[PDB]
Scaffold this motif. Structure first.
Motif, PDB file in Angstrom:
ATOM      1  N   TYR A 115      65.767  -6.005   1.239  1.00 33.59           N
ATOM      2  CA  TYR A 115      66.150  -4.637   0.927  1.00 33.59           C
ATOM      3  C   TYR A 115      66.972  -4.018   2.051  1.00 33.59           C
ATOM      4  N   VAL A 116      66.560  -4.248   3.302  1.00 33.50           N
ATOM      5  CA  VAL A 116      67.281  -3.665   4.425  1.00 33.50           C
ATOM      6  C   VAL A 116      68.717  -4.202   4.451  1.00 33.50           C
ATOM      7  N   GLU A 117      68.888  -5.477   4.110  1.00 32.02           N
ATOM      8  CA  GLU A 117      70.251  -6.045   4.035  1.00 32.02           C
ATOM      9  C   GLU A 117      71.127  -5.307   3.016  1.00 32.02           C
ATOM     10  N   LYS A 118      70.571  -4.986   1.839  1.00 30.76           N
ATOM     11  CA  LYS A 118      71.320  -4.217   0.839  1.00 30.76           C
ATOM     12  C   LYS A 118      71.596  -2.806   1.313  1.00 30.76           C
ATOM     13  N   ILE A 119      70.622  -2.189   1.985  1.00 34.79           N
ATOM     14  CA  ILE A 119      70.801  -0.844   2.494  1.00 34.79           C
ATOM     15  C   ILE A 119      71.988  -0.811   3.441  1.00 34.79           C
ATOM     16  N   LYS A 120      72.002  -1.711   4.420  1.00 33.97           N
ATOM     17  CA  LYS A 120      73.139  -1.770   5.339  1.00 33.97           C
ATOM     18  C   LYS A 120      74.463  -2.029   4.589  1.00 33.97           C
ATOM     19  N   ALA A 121      74.485  -2.970   3.641  1.00 35.04           N
ATOM     20  CA  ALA A 121      75.707  -3.224   2.862  1.00 35.04           C
ATOM     21  C   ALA A 121      76.195  -1.973   2.142  1.00 35.04           C
ATOM     22  N   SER A 122      75.273  -1.143   1.662  1.00 33.76           N
ATOM     23  CA  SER A 122      75.658  -0.007   0.835  1.00 33.76           C
ATOM     24  C   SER A 122      76.326   1.083   1.658  1.00 33.76           C
TER      25      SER A 122
END
Lengths: 146, 13
Positions: free
Chosen positions: A52-59
Motif C-alpha cells: 500500500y505504501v508503494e501505491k501511496i508514493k506512486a500516487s
C-alpha cells in the motif's frame, strides 16, 4: 521537542500515555491531527502495508511521516512493552481506527532494538533513529496533501 | 491516484 502527547489504547491489550517524536517526513501539524487517544482497532500484515505504501508514493497525493513513541512513566513503559510484544510476536502491525480528518491511515510498527529498519522507510528524511536504541513502537502516518 | 486503504483484521471486543 515531542510533537504529540496522548494515549495509545488497544482494548484488552494495553493502554498507556506516550510522547511522539519525529523520525522521518514533516511532522508539521501532528499535534492537531492526532486524537487524544489513538484507538488500535486491529492488526495487519506488514507486506500489505508496504504494498500500500508503494501505491501511496506512486500516487503523489499523500504525505508519509514516521514518528517514534516513548512511554511517559515507568507504569506506561510496562504497557508499552506489552503492546510491542503483542505485535512483534505475531509479526503484525497495528491499525489505528479513530483517525482524524487529515490522516488517511496510521499504523503502529514494532521495531526491535536489533532489527533492521524496513526498507520502504529508508532513507529517513528527518532525525532518524539512533543505532543503539531500545525496542520501539513507530507510527507510520499517511496524511492528505493540500 | 488515491489508493484505497487496505482491509485489516479487527481485534477489539
Amino acid at each position: 521537542n515531542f510533537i504529540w502527547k496522548g494515549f495509545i489504547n488497544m482494548p484488552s491489550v494495553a493502554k498507556f500515555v506516550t510522547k511522539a517524536y519525529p523520525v522521518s517526513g514533516s511532522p508539521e501539524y501532528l499535534t492537531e491531527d492526532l486524537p487524544d487517544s489513538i484507538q488500535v482497532g486491529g492488526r495487519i500484515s506488514p507486506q500489505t502495508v508496504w504494498d500500500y505504501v508503494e501505491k501511496i508514493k506512486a500516487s503523489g497525493t499523500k504525505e508519509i511521516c514516521v514518528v517514534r513513541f516513548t512511554p511517559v512513566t515507568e507504569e506506561d513503559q510496562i504497557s508499552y512493552t506489552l503492546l510491542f510484544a503483542y505485535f512483534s510476536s505475531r509479526k503484525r502491525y497495528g491499525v489505528a481506527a479513530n483517525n482524524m480528518k487529515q490522516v488517511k491511515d496510521m499504523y503502529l510498527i514494532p521495531l526491535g532494538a536489533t532489527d533492521k529498519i524496513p526498507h520502504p522507510l529508508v532513507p529517513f528524511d528527518g532525525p532518524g533513529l539512533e543505532l543503539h536504541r531500545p525496542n520501539l513502537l513507530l507510527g507510520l502516518i499517511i496524511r492528505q496533501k493540500l | 491516484y488515491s489508493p484505497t486503504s487496505p482491509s485489516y483484521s479487527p481485534t477489539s471486543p
